[PDB]
Every structure is written in structure tokens, then in C-alpha cells.
Symmetry: D3
Amino acid sequence: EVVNMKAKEIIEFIETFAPKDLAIEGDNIGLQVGDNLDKEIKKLGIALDPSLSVIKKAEKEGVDFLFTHHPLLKDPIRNFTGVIYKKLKILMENDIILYSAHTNLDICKNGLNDALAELYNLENPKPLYDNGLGRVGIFKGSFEEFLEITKKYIHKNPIVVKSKEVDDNFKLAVLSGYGLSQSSIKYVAEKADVYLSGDLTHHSKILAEELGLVVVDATHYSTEVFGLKKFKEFLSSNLDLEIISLDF
Amino acid sequence: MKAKEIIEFIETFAPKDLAIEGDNIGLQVGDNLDKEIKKLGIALDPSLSVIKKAEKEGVDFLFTHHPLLKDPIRNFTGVIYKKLKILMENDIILYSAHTNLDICKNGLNDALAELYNLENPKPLYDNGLGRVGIFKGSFEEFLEITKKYIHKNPIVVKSKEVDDNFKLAVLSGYGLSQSSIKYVAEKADVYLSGDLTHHSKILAEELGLVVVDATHYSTEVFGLKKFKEFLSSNLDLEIISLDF
Amino acid sequence: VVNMKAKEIIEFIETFAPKDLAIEGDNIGLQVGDNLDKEIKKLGIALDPSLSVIKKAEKEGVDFLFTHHPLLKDPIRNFTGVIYKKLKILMENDIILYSAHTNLDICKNGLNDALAELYNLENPKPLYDNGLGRVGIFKGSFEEFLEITKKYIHKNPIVVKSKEVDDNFKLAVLSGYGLSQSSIKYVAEKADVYLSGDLTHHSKILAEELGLVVVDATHYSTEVFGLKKFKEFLSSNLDLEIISLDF
Amino acid sequence: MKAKEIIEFIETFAPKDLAIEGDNIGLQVGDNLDKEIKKLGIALDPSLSVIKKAEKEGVDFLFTHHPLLKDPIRNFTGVIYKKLKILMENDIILYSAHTNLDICKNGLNDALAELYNLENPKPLYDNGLGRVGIFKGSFEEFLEITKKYIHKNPIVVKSKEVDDNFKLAVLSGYGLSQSSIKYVAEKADVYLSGDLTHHSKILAEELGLVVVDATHYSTEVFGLKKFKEFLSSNLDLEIISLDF
Amino acid sequence: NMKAKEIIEFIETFAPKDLAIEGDNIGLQVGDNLDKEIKKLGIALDPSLSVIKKAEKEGVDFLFTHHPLLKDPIRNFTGVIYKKLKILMENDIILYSAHTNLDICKNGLNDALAELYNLENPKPLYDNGLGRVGIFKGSFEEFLEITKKYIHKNPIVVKSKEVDDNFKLAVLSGYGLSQSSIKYVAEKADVYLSGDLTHHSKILAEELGLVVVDATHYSTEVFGLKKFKEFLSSNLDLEIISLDF
Amino acid sequence: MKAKEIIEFIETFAPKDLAIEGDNIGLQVGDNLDKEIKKLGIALDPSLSVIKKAEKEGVDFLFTHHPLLKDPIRNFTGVIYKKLKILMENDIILYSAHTNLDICKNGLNDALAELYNLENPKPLYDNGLGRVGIFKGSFEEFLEITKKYIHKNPIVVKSKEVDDNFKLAVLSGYGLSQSSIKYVAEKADVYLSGDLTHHSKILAEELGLVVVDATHYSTEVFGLKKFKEFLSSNLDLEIISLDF
Ligand SMILES: [Fe+2]
Ligand SMILES: [Fe+2]
Ligand SMILES: [Fe+2]
Ligand SMILES: [Fe+2]
Ligand SMILES: [Fe+2]
Ligand SMILES: [Fe+2]
């Protein structure tokens, strides 16, 4: 039986899986665009980004509730022109609800970071940061086995900054999305031998090389979508509601 | 005519660089400025009911004196959702001239200064806000003009007696903050503006500045009506007012 | 009827309205004064430490001047004009000036409680986290609420009738200036009717959009109501001549 | 020649007041600038491996494009300790020209502009960073030049089709921040720079700005080689490159 | 008799208020009516309590001080500041200050020092106009002797290096010996004459080889303030006394 | 002994979490802490001449009371260059216990308190800085103690007469800021500290607080000598003093 749900029921279910208070300070989570949460929902769409093409695709596929991992806006605005105008207009004239679980989806049990920790079967995993982001533990295997898993399940040509030789049973840190800032490299260099994340840039590569931290950039997109598919299939398994993905 | 032409006409009258630092002037809501405009609506406030009225009257371009938002947001729920939904669904352009319309020649403050026929008028503040000059008449005559053209029942804080030919300061809108009262007490005998509150009243009494609160609304709408008729004289376009 | 030392008056007042109830940054306590052993024959109560109030205190032989509002919110480092004239009257007459501001707003039976008890609010709770204001159910009609306002607070209150109000509605009260834009947004989530003072245009417009009915009974009157209660509380307990200056 | 003479030559080419606000340009590590210099080393980064190589090759004056530290410190441990110790015990001078070398005439951004032979080039930002102008040719010809001279396999974010004689913006190093994307989208059809990340890619696609990431390293090293060759041509001094 | 506002325009002609550095609390400290007639003007370095007590005792009407009454703003009046204001207000004594505008102006406190040492072709030491620097045409010992004879009998000398004749001398009246000041002046001079030396600044001067002479905050200012006092006495028909010097 | 063992011993005496907020305590300069230590040097200040003397005397672990840098830097030239070059090329560890050594039991302030035999001593400030208590004797006896054990000719600001059995506050180093004078005036009759300047002197006189400046150096070196003898008594290690 596939059935219609009210928006508020979907939201309460998502927030049971990924409570809002797990979100780190200042993260723009929750209702992005919407008014009435009693709205009946026929079709739930899941996306990584609330991009313009995702929102156009939501309109085309008759999506009533659009879930995105990333918030619509990180920085507040007071004028509505260009792209943000095009996006809000499509959402508002179609009364499409836009809702986000961001770092709360990263941090929660079986969330985006746990999905990575489980894929690599990390021994005794711990949160990588104090705020609960990322996971770290021992990878029980060779660097090459880790690489093959990375290539088979996450991304084919990952960038490897092979700063040093890596022995079997090494400490592996994972962080879905963008974990490769300079300050993150410095912090993680103390906690792990290998750091798997996304969005490598030049100064961070150089730093990783100086510190002997092996960094694997399997992209921002892929390291999050892996967990986001698990999330989608979790929702499909529990809600009798048509659910589609839009940018994955 | 097209929206960008209405906008260039307004910005010729009241240039954007006249706005004080940080004022959210210009385009509030809109994308295509080549859009043809049949009906222009003028409002003091971009309130929910004003926006509902614009939609109802087939307004294509909504001009307001106050910006839609002072403080930036990153979620769209409740009232702002309702306002944006009406504007966006109908492609109604929302555009504002705020302090640039206060400050410019023949703008809202010049309108008050001209109503009272101020002798040798000067900007009240360095940034160009407000006007001050001599009111060539008695206090009571100043009051009669106020009641006849701006507001029938102004609040008068009669901190001292006012002799004929006094210095009168005007500031359309909200000019009655505590720091304004202190500043204007040095420059004028009588201060005509809006939105008086308790502490500013006490302060004016202490300083001996006579303050006349003819309301925020009326002291702006007077000049805003002049602006509307100016637009009507120059633009071949249906132009209506929505909250005045 | 007898004379008291200033510090005895201060201790009685701070027993009623403890300083630690004051919100962050509030300039409460001693405003102007040195020696607190000074004997006090006449205590004067005022809402504002205005220039005319201070002149009246001098004229009536007030030794201890209590005001609800602090003399200064913003600190200064030059003493001219009005503040010069005021300090000179206080110092030349050695008049002690002391204030209870938000600690008097927040304390039990203080300015906000006075309003809550006046409207007989059912199960009142603090309106804001810092303890400012009160909110609860008004057991009656909107009309009965307005009459109480007109009978006890202010004759012609401004009413922003943003929506219809049914009997037994949620009423929020806040003595003084509670009508800022951010207050309207916050209180709109908590009550049907908001009674406070000092309404200005943008707040009025905002209240209308949110459906919050706003009643402006003025800054002065919504505080003086409780300030009269305070004055009577002092008179019942202190053997001392006590007058009011701006009410 | 003395270190101060090398410094004066570089600063004549790329004056320090051209550096943007807060940029840590000039002398990074050094004391005596009267010291005579036998071997000058040029590097993009003052990395630990670059500094070690400098010692091994007997470099006494080490020039880098990037400053040693952006953020100030007050403790000396770990990597920064190893770097300072090698520089200090060997009295190797470390000197940087950063954004002043990006902005100056024939500096890193001009070199890109000249490579693409931009028609009527202007600075991309007000502060002088980047260049923008017309590429007199097809997008494919533009790609071919990029592949031959800068990076064999650039990432192309093909947000839209690009017509011949399009507007090309170049910015050596990292010019692909989100605010940079939004800004450059109004000035150019194609944005050539380095260090593309996910949110910026998405933004570029939404805006129709075609972005070509030829890497941070390669888009700087191209001009840094021209700078090296200019030094070699004018200074009677051994000059080597260390990380390129 | 002359009015208070006339004394103020006279002082401000000598030392214009726009010369004061950003944020300096110069001008009218305590007072209302400036049409007030003034019989007796008192000059002081500090508006201290005892200076203000002395002002009342001597019938001073206009109290001029180099230092402002308050640097940091207040919003309560108790203890010492209550006592100072009470004396000024019940006696209607006007309190007025010229602070850095008096340090910086032509023939002001820093120029007074520069002239004492006959500095060859002097320039302002800081961009904002504070201090003076130039060549002292003589030996270090001759410089010390002038210091001992005219400013302070026994200055603290931090002798960080030997000093050759015809050296560069920087002077700054009052407190010029902060750590950031030592670093700055070390680039500009061989010898630094000022007041209020403390331990970290002393160490820093030794490291940089900057010779520092602390002839005290008080003396390096009172020297010029006496010249200022005689300047007023020569031009104003008015009884003028000094209170803490 | 290894460097880390010396550090663990010092931190047992003066725990790092006792330091006031932001105080730059701990490792200033050093990399390898398993290093065995040949000679420990103690200094008040990590000055240039102190560090030179350490090199000359073969000190490999240099302890100072004052941190090397309070304000972080990002360029390394002049004096700081000369200092780091010596520490780094000789691999000399530089470590500081600053306010944690001021506050800890038998630390610098306790040493003063015990010297004057303060009756029933308390911390002067909430954060644990300084000590205050009753001096069981005359002002003159206090002065005689000050002259014999701390500094001959201390500067005395004799703001009022001092009766026997007065309250004495002590603070090793710089305790004579204006806000400290105001604070201590409420708590003691006499304030013993260092680094007096003019405005503080005037302020003390206004408040009637008697202030004795026995100098920054000496009021700390007294306790620092006790600390040195404590280390010498407990560690099988050569220990010398460098600036005292
Ligand atoms: Fe992400
Ligand atoms: Fe307005
Ligand atoms: Fe109030
Ligand atoms: Fe770069
Ligand atoms: Fe001074
Ligand atoms: Fe110290």
C-alpha cells in the first residue's frame, strides 16, 4: 500500500532518526521553505543540494516534499533576485515544502558518518570531533584493501596524498563531505594515519604532506551520497509513501 | 513601459548613493527588469495587507518607502513566506526608495520644509536627513498648518513657550530617538517628527525642546503623496496608492 | 514617625527587590551618593530622575530620592548641561539618589506582578526567560479586559485590533516598554493580547501581520500602577515621611 | 650581490603597497639584509620539503610566492619548529611576494592574460586581482591553449555552451570561492582559476558560468616561471626553482 | 574681568582641539555657564582630589588640568568622583583640559623638550604628532647634565649601548615608554627621553640597544606646563597660580 | 632526567590549569621532549642576554617565569630572530610557568606572604593572584623587612598614616594598575608590588591606599629563588640562575 502522509509526520519521523539538537551550533537545519505543515504529501524527494536544477526536477516530477541534506542558505539575505528568486518562486507557486537535516544527519546514529565507518568496518569507532562530526577507528587491513573498498563503493579515481607509507591495521578517520580544511588536517594528523573525506585544495595537500597525514579525497559529493542513499532506503522501508532521489 | 525604466526614473529623482550607509534600498523582490508594467502601486509599508491589495488590484510594480526586510533571514516561513509567495507567483516587482527618498531634493523632508515655508532651510543632519530653518509666524500658526495638512491631533510636548519666528526642525518618519532629541535641542526650538516614546519625551522637557509628534505615518505620507503625483505627471502609467 | 539612615532604607528595598534579579547590564543601586549613614527624614518616590523631579525633590526637602529608572544608561566622562544641573542639585543638597529598575519589574509583587494580579491572570508565568513580563489566561471577555485597563491604568489606551479575541484568551503584560519589533514577534507566539507601552509604527504594522492584538496603555501608566503599590508597601512598613514626585 | 639588493629588485617589479589588506608579504625569516647572496631559490610554497631542499642545494635566499604563516603564533613546536630551525641555523633568508606579485604589471595574473592574448584586459576585482577580457577565438581553442601551457587535464564545469569571442576571466591560484563565483558570473562567460570545491561547482552551474579549474599550483607556476626567467635575465646570480 | 569662554578660546588658539588624538577626552570636563566671570585661574597637571581641594581653598574659579578628569566613562557617582564633583559644583568651579592637544601643538609640552635640548631640525616622532626627534648636537654626558639641571635630578638611565656624540634624540613628555613605543622608537633614535618606565619595557630597550632615560612622567610634563603657565600669565590680565607644581 | 620529566615535576608544583585565562604558559620552544637534559637554567625573563648566557653555559632546558611571546607574530626578524636561532640551533628547550607559578601553593605570592608572616592569608583576587592578611607589626618593621629581603629604597606612596596590625596585600610582579589600585583600596591598608606609574600613584593618594613599589623584578625574584632551591633540593640535576 502506497499512501499520502502529512508533512508534519514526515518531519517527526526524520527528526526521530536525526534529532535537531544533534546539529552543531549555527547550522541552518529544519524547515527551509514552507508554511502549512498539515499539507498532504504524495511524493517525497531526496537531494544532496537544493540546487536550481534539483528544484526544477522536483517541480517536474511532482514532488510535494523536498528533503535536502544541505540548507538552502547558509548566509542570510534581505533581497530576492536572480537564482534565489527562481528557486523560491518554483517552491512557492507549487507549495513545495523544503526541509533539511544537515549536520544532525551527519552526526546521528547510522547517519552519514556512521555509514562510512560501517563500510570500512572500523574497529571500536569514536566520534572524530568533540561536536560529534566524523568517526575514527582502526582499519583492520592493508592500505590497498582500504583503497579498493573506496574505489568500489565510493568513488573510482580518488585523489591520494600519499604523505607516508601506511602499515596494516592503521588508524582511519572518515568525514563525509568537506573535512579537509587546513585546521582539520592539523587536528586529524594527531588522531589518524589516513583521512578519508572530500574537497581537497592546494594548501591543505601541502600541509598534509608536511605532517605525514595520508589524505584521500573521494569527493564531497560521493562521501555524502553513500550515506544519503542508506537514508533514502531507510525512509522507503518505513514510510508507505512514494520516494525518489533527485541529484543521485 | 518596462520596469527598468520606472526604476531609472525613480533613481534619477532619488539616487541610490544618497541612502545612508546600510539602508536596504533598491530592488527588494524581482528578477526580470525588462518586464512590461501596466499598473504601478505606491505604499508606505510593504505590509502583508498592502501586498494582498497589490495582487487584488492587478498591480505589476509595487513601490514602497520602507524596505521589505531590514534584517537578513535564511528561512522562509510564516508572514514572509506569505508575502514572497504573492509577489513571486504574480511576478510583482517590489522596489524601495528609503532614506534616499528622505534626503533627496523635493524628497520627504524637503516636502515638510516646503509645507512650513522654512526660511533659509538647511539639512538637519550631516548625512542630509531632516531640514531646519526659520518658521516665519507664530507657534499657533505652525500648529494650524500641522493639523490641516499632516495630522489633526498631534502630540505636543510644550517644554517651553515658543516665540514667533522660531527655528523649526522637521524629520519625516522616526526622528524622535533620545540621541536625536539631544542633537536637535542644539539646533531648533521646535522639532516636528514622529514616533514619540516616554524617555524621549522626558528628555525634550529637560532640554526645553518643544516636540510635535504628528506620527511616523502622516509625516512621511505627506511627502509620499507629492512623490506619487510627481510620478503621475511624468509617467504614462496607471498609478494607485495602497496604504494611503 | 521617625528618621532613618539611608542604608536602612536600601536594605529594606533590596529585601523586596533583590539586586541579583536585575537583568544583565542594568544600572541598578546607588546612582548618586557617598555617605549612607546619612539620616533620612523624607523619602521621595519618582518614575524618572528627571530634571523637574530633582528640582521638586530639592523644593520639598527630600533626603532620599528613589527612582525606578536609572539616572544614566550610557556612561559619560564630561559633566555639562542637564546632567550638570542635576548632579549639582543632588550634591549641593546632599540628596541620595537610588534606583530599582528591572529588579523591581521582576520581583514578587513588583511592577509586572502588579499587572498580572490586576488582571487576575490564571496560572501566571514569566513572559521572558530573564523573568520580565507575565503571561496567563484572562478569565473574561476582551471587553472586560479593556474596562479593567481603562478603570485602573489609562483611560484611552491605543488598541491595535489585529484579530477578533474570544473570551478566556492568553494575555501578556509588560510594564513600560515591551513593544519592540522583536518583542512583538516573540509575544505573538505566546499570547492573543499584549498589554504594554510605547507603541511605534513598525511595531504596529508587525502586530497586525501576526494577528497579535496590542494595547498601548503607555509606558508611564503601566509602570506607575505598580509603583504606587510599591509606595504604599513602603509607607505601611517604614515610619518615615514618603511622597511621590511625578505621580 | 646583497639580500637587500635582491629585495629591492623584486619590490621594484612588485611594490608592496600593491598587496591587498592584511597580506603577509615581505621578509618572513631573516635578520641581516647586508648578507651577500650566492644562490637564490624560487618556490611556490615555503613547505618543509622545499626548505630542506633549499638547505641541501646551498640556497641562501629563498623566495616563495606564499607567506610562511597566515595566522600568527606564539609557540614553536612541530612542523614550524623544524622549518625555522633549518632556516635559522643556516641563515637562509625567507622572503615572500604574494598578492603584490599577483596584481603587479606582468605578474601572475597578467601572465595568464597575455598567454590567452585577452582583448582589452582589465583587472577582475577592484583591488587589482585577476584579469578579464575577450578571448578572440573558440572555447576549444581556449581549452587547447590551457592544455598545452597550464595543465594537461583541467576540470571543466560546462554550465552552458560558449560562443566564440567570449569574455574570459583568469585568476591565478584560488579564485573559485562561492562569492568569487557569484561576482565573476556577472563579468565573464568563462572563469579560469584553481581549487574548485563542490558548493562552488553547484553555484557555477546555477549561474551558467563556465569554470575551468587548471589547479591552484599550475595557474600560479606558469607566471612564477616567467618571474624566475625575468630575474635570471637581469641578475648576475645563480637562480633555481625548488617545487617547480 | 574676563569670562570663562574667553579663557577657553585663548587656550584653544594656542592648542586647537582638533590636534587631540582620537578618543582623547579634551575640553570642558565640568561646567555649564561659560559666560561666567573668572577672577582666579589655577593650573594643574592632575585633576586630583587634593588639587581640587586646594582649588577651593585658594578661591580658584577656573581649574585647568593637563589630564582629563576621566578616561573611562562612568554612570554612577560615589566615593572619590562624588567628592571631586561635589567640590567643583557647589563652588561652580569650571574644570577644563588640554591633554594631547597640548602635547602636540606648537610650543607645547613636546616642543618645550625639543627646544631645551636644542634638537637640530626636529620632526614629530609619531604620525599623530606626538613626541619630537632630532639630532642632539653634543655628547651624551652633556645631554644628561641638561636633563639633571632642568627636568629631574636623577633620571633612571637604561644604558643599553654606548652613545656617540651628535646622536639622535627622541623625547616624549609623560608616558612614552610602552613596549610598542620602545620598538618603534628603537628604529628612530639612539636615546629616548620620557617617563613611566616599567620592567618589560626596560628589558626590551636593552635587547634593542635603545638607551632609555626615565626623567619621570611628572617632570617631563611639568617642564612644559610651567612654560605654558607663564605664557598665560604674560597674555591674560588674570591671577594665575599653579596647584600641584 | 628527560625534559618531559622536568616539565611533569614543575607542573606538579604549579599546575597549568591554575594559570589565568590566555596566559601563554608551558612549552614556548622545543620539539623533542624525550631529550635527556644536561643542565637546567632558571631565569625571570627570556631576554636576549639570558638566552645568550644559556648557550654560553651549556643550558639545554631553559625555564623562564615570563612567556617568550604574549602577542602572536607571523614574521621572524630582529630580536626574536636572534633568540629563536640560538634556541633552535642548540636544541635548547624553553618552557614557562607564569601565573600558575604566581598562584600555586608556596609559589611567588605565597613566598611574599610567608616573608611578611601574614596572619591568616587569603588570595587577593578571585583568580588566586596575590595574598592579603594582617601584618603583626609596625609599618616601619614592614619597611625594614622590605629593605633587607626585597629591595633597598622601595618607592613608598605614603597616602595616609598606617597603624600597627594593618592589612597588607602583596602581589609579585606588576600589581599596580589603576584598576588594581581601586580594587585593593577596598581590601588592604598597604599594597606591596612593582611597576608603579604616575596615574596609579595619584589614584592611591586619592583613595588613601599606601603603595610600596619594591620593583617588578625583585618582588618576583624573591620567590623565584625559593623555587630554584626547591628544584635543586629534589632533582638530581645541575641547576643555575641566569638573570639573578
Ligand atoms: Fe556537504
Ligand atoms: Fe519611516
Ligand atoms: Fe520604564
Ligand atoms: Fe596561491
Ligand atoms: Fe601625562
Ligand atoms: Fe612579572
